[PDB]
Design a protein around this ligand. Structure first.
Ligand SMILES: *C[C@@]1(O)C[C@@H](C(=O)O)C[C@@H](O)[C@@H]1O
Ligand SMILES: *C[C@@]1(O)C[C@@H](C(=O)O)C[C@@H](O)[C@@H]1O
Ligand SMILES: [Li+]
Lengths: 237, 237
């Protein structure tokens, strides 16, 4: 496994020259730029397209992933489910997007999720289907079943982010992703959050995961480190 | 856990000034200098004492560990068991030694091992009781039982080094050391060898282990990295 390094950013509507300078300073470390958008209250596809245009010089160095992380999965986004899913579907129309995050949880409308995913894939977008538990790390068998349900949508990536309470929870997440990687077709990404889980981010490739997320400024999630230091780590394993 | 970094050396009877200079150049990275001696055919306590003087160990720089690794546990040492154990016991008489490795395996004479360990401890030596499997990684429960048997001798450290052939084997070693660390009094050290196991060496402290072994020149065991890079890694977790 060669792990791709994802740099998470979270600008308001007007992306600042100072952010552009920070990205450029880390350019060799960035395989994917993750534009978070849930922090933009009442964000529209038009506004997203405007932001993407400003990040079109370094297009040649990285893929662009757009993520709207809902409040209930630990982000800022307060859209109702229908507005959220309408946003995700509309992102297909932006040419400069390469990857799109869509959230999985137990209450989703399956056939609708599959219609959206098919739609994004028809538009040549890579789909990351994601699930987050900021409270705890379910037991091994449960983490595996979550991976199982997410992969039935035939995404390009399945991503599971969980919060460890102890060392065993960290090892369970690593085991879940390792067993998935050895047995299943699509790419997997596991994150054990917080300082305790940092090893999941640095040794992600050892256990067969495809992406690791870091930051440019402050951590955008518990345990994130700067992408320059993250790239150096990934290269060691 | 603050992990101590061990630098493994394996010189001939006459230690060359060039080695001493390499050690001194890495003094900030070295908490323990491990003088391997099994590579000296028919080595005596007198010859070990001569080599120790030749190191000219400076006050307050690193602890000195002396290790005779037997051929059957993956070293070079061809001593019969009685000669081996007589060597281990005689090491107590060398003032400059701080720590001594003694090997555990299923067929040991327990009461004799305990007599020797008590003896070393009466001489103010820290005892590292160690076990190595260069072939494979036993299952979790077996790794735990090995740790259990080794700790009954009330050593200062229990050390288990095993060879992974897949991701689950690496995770099993990490789980065994973590559970030991959480439940038992004495210090624990775990090594999953080879490149696949490198994470056990760099994230040792995450899982509660007390030592991590690296090299000066060439790797002295599969997966070792240079102690300067090892110290930097330990500091990240
Ligand atoms: C995928 C994701 O939730 C992982 C977070 C992390 O823990 O690094 C960062 C988020 O920006 C990201 O969408
Ligand atoms: C403890 C020990 O057997 C571990 C080896 C390793 O895998 O780094 C190095 C040996 O010198 C050492 O005694
Ligand atoms: Li690392």
């Amino acid at each position: 496994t060669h792990v791709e390094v994802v740099a998470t950013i979270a600008p308001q509507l007007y992306i600042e020259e100072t952010l552009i300078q920070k990205i450029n300073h880390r350019i060799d470390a960035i395989d994917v730029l993750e534009l978070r958008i849930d922090q933009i209250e009442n964000v529209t596809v038009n506004q997203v397209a405007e932001m993407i245009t400003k990040l079109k010089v370094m297009q040649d160095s990285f893929k662009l992933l757009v993520t709207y992380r809902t409040k209930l999965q630990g982000g800022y986004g307060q859209f109702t489910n229908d507005l959220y899913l309408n946003l995700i579907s509309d992102l297909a129309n932006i040419n400069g997007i390469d990857m799109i995050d869509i959230e999985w949880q137990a209450d989703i409308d399956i056939e609708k999720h599959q219609r959206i995913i098919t739609h994004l894939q028809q538009y040549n977008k890579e789909v990351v289907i994601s699930h987050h538990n900021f409270e705890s790390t379910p037991p091994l068998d449960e983490l595996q079943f979550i991976f199982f349900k997410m992969q039935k949508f035939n995404p390009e990536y399945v991503k599971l982010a969980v919060m460890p309470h102890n060392k065993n929870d960290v090892l369970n997440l690593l085991q879940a992703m390792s067993t998935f990687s050895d047995t299943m077709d699509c790419k997997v990404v596991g994150i054990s959050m917080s300082k305790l889980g940092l090893i999941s981010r640095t040794a992600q490739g050892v256990f067969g995961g495809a992406l690791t997320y870091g930051c440019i400024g402050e951590p955008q999630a518990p345990g994130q480190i700067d992408v320059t230091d993250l790239k150096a780590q990934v290269t060691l394993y």
